[PDB]
Design a protein around this ligand. Structure first.
Ligand SMILES: O=C(O[C@H]1CCS(=O)(=O)c2ccc(Br)cc21)[C@H]1C[C@]2(CN1)C(=O)Nc1ccccc12
Length: 394
């Protein structure tokens, strides 16, 4: 798995991308690794934020599916013509694959200036692929076409005129034991659509938020690599901030900081991480009654930003934000750990990363088991609308 080690690059808060080549002869692109979508979509026309793009015309292997695709997220929209081509991950498994490609012809607030990515690699399930579940996702194609085991793991690692460079690893087909320390704990994938988990309990410096666990998973809890922040639902974010503020009461920060719209600065290397609390998310274990906690350090939820003016100071952005689409375990969470997407066994494993950011007093931890007798169902049931009820799947 060494050839796959350090295969992810990127800028802080703009995403982790993997180099892929599309077509015959292979056109090389930088593709955003995203676990909260199921589409393999690439820039196929000029755009001001696009250095290069996919040119179908120059591929002997390109096939037009004579069908269009339109994908609007809550933050971003893209659209294009669907087809298939030969896809390969240079610094991934030594395999070439015939995959569905969505050639992005028009987009809106999707591509990021200087992010260095020309497309998206939707690693989630068919159940969320567009225009429907019959459009086979890349990973699904990779497994059906090769002998590649139905699993992948991500090791996302953190970090003055440009943003700070990020590194990381995408291991397709297995687990790399040198990427983690300690035990690898698993949480069931609730449903195969998004990589859905169930958070059963939350604690800020040991102090339980004391909320009804369904609120932690309202309306869903997902693991998304294409999200920078730990996005929580309105009620949970409110409780979390009230608590974080309480532990960091010695120093008073502006309101714009908690809304993640402003930095806070301390003289180089004088940052008081000690005054900041740990967030422990308790995830539902493989055994019913059982759970394990993933502990996150202020070094994860406080993203550093080196401002051109305040270059002599260490400035940070509060990387916990509000969400209406549920809890999102983005890069903030992921950076501390080695995350295993064990699709084969319908589960997600976490272990302490061999690359995470920490201080001499505290360390990001994966600990368990924690038993809870007569524990309620923490998962939420999304009201079934007439649009979702109308659908047919054979
Ligand atoms: O979670 C995700 O997508 C979800 C978001 C909630 S949603 O409900 O807007 C939605 C809808 C359909 C699909 Br497929 C995925 C998603 C994906 C898409 C995501 C982040 N990760 C994004 O939201 N903007 C953006 C912009 C550039 C690159 C990636 C993204």
């Amino acid at each position: 798995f060494v050839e796959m080690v350090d295969n992810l690059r990127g800028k802080s808060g703009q995403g982790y991308y993997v180099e892929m080549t599309v077509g015959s002869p292979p056109q090389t692109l930088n593709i955003l690794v995203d676990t909260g979508s199921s589409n393999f979509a690439v820039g196929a026309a000029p755009h001001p934020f696009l250095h290069r793009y996919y040119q179908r015309q120059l591929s002997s292997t390109y096939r037009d599916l004579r069908k269009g695709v339109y994908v609007p997220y809550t933050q971003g929209k893209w659209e294009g013509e669907l087809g298939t081509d030969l896809v390969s991950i240079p610094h991934g498994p030594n395999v070439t694959v015939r995959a569905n490609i969505a050639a992005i012809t028009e987009s809106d607030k999707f591509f990021i200036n200087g992010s260095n990515w020309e497309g998206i690699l939707g690693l989630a399930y068919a159940e969320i692929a567009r225009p429907d579940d019959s459009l086979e996702p890349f990973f699904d194609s990779l497994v059906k076409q090769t002998h590649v085991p139905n699993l992948f793991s991500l090791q996302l690692c953190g970090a003055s005129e440009v943003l700070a460079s990020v590194g990381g690893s995408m291991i397709i087909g297995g687990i790399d034991h040198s990427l983690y320390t300690g035990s690898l704990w698993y949480t069931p994938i609730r449903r195969e659509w998004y990589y859905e988990v169930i958070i059963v309990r939350v604690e800020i410096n040991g102090q339980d938020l004391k909320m009804d666990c369904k609120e932690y998973n309202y309306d869903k809890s997902i693991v998304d690599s294409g999200t920078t922040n730990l996005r929580l639902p309105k009620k949970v974010f409110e409780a979390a901030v009230k608590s974080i503020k309480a532990a960091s009461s010695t120093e008073k920060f502006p309101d714009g900081f908690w809304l993640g719209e402003q930095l806070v600065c301390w003289q180089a290397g004088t940052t008081p991480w000690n005054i900041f609390p740990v967030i422990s998310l308790y995830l539902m274990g493989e055994v019913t009654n059982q759970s394990f906690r993933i502990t996150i350090l202020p070094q994860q939820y406080l993203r550093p930003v080196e401002d051109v003016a305040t270059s002599q100071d260490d400035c940070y952005k509060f990387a916990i934000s509000q969400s209406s689409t549920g809890t999102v375990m983005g890069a903030v969470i992921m950076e501390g750990f080695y995350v295993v997407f064990d699709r084969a066994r319908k589960r997600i494993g976490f272990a302490v990363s061999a690359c995470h950011v920490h201080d001499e007093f505290r360390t990001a931890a994966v600990e368990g088991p924690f038993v809870t007798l007569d524990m309620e169902d923490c998962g939420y049931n999304i009201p079934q609308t007439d649009e979702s009820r109308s659908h047919h799947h054979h």
